[PDB]
Swiss-Prot record, chain B:
Function: Attaches the virion to the cell membrane by interacting with host receptor, initiating the infection. Binding to human ACE2 and CLEC4M/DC-SIGNR receptors and internalization of the virus into the endosomes of the host cell induces conformational changes in the S glycoprotein. Proteolysis by cathepsin CTSL may unmask the fusion peptide of S2 and activate membrane fusion within endosomes.
Protein name as it appears in the record: Spike protein S1
Covered residues, full protein: 547 to 595 of 1255
Gene: S
Gene source species: Severe acute respiratory syndrome coronavirus (SARS-CoV)
Sites carrying sugar chains: N43
């Protein structure tokens, strides 16, 4: 049977959020080539999905 | 004095001395992004932001 107590305080770290990233495929795909967009629009909604 | 142009960590052109004179800086990236549409609801009104 214990006779004395010991009040302790522990810590616990848990992530709840991350980096809200947003990549624009208009600049990533077809950076500056104006003729590149004509072929990029041929694929479809890969920049929308 | 020997470096004319300079890249960034992402390997993109960031600044370069003026090749003629004045020894000045150079372009900066333009503005872009994903434009979103805010609508309070077509049943209530037809506003848009």
């Amino acid at each position: 049977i214990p006779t004395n107590f010991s009040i302790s305080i522990t810590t616990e770290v848990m992530p709840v959020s991350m980096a809200k990233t947003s990549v624009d495929c208009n600049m990533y795909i077809c950076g500056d080539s104006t003729e590149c967009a004509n072929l990029l629009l041929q694929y479809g909604s890969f920049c929308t999905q | 004095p020997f470096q004319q142009f300079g890249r960034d960590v992402s390997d993109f052109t960031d600044s370069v001395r003026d090749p003629k004179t004045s020894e000045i800086l150079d372009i900066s990236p333009c503005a872009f992004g994903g434009v979103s549409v805010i609508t309070p609801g077509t049943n209530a009104s037809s506003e848009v932001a």
